[PDB]
Amino acid sequence: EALMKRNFCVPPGASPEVPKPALSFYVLGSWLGGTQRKEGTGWGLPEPQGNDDNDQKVHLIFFGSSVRWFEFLHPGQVYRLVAPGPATPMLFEKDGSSCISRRPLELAGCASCLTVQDNWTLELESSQDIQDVLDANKSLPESSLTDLLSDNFTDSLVSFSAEILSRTLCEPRRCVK
């Protein structure tokens, strides 16, 4: 999702104060394995992923000083985060309701959220190790010409890849064409 001004929601069990509008965003992604522990230079064998009926989808709210990581996130790339310190159980599954769990108005009711912590950092994995997953790094998804140009008016989600011809700004409403 893009970066803009966002409003959080009421924290669970905290004071009922309106969250301030703060610049932030969030991402959606799918896991590849269970809890993993560091071992020497690398990391130990991860725990098996729970065979749960819940979809292996997570939402990560980025805010505070973590906004600086926005420019290093792109679809189809393998990302592994790290939580410094001891491997405390129940840390990569869902937000802790007791701790700071503030979500935007469009994500408060989601059943799959994981707010990042400042001490956490993110690194990019190697190509050879996870080459199997990287095989799906084809062209980014895009709707057909018929779907984009059919009349209807159902649905407002489209995607393509074009080449800019001309640019012009509009002023009296602020608009750039």
Next chain:
Amino acid sequence: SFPTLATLKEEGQRKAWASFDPKALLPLPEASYLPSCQLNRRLAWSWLCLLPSAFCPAQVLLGVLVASSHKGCLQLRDQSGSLPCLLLAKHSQPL
């Protein structure tokens, strides 16, 4: 030659504002058949590109990458100051 970020920015801004001739952008006779609002809207925007290697002598950009935690804009930073920057990898592959 090795320039500083502030000097490069000031030189670029001065050169950009130097050659801003409206007559060059909209020559005859297209403007001769235009209303005021359309003319003003058309002249409102422009752009320019500069290659430092074409100057006498050549120039080389050097700086330290800094990712601030306020606006999410990566910058090249030195003691003189900072500068917005855009980073891309080979063959249309994002950094």
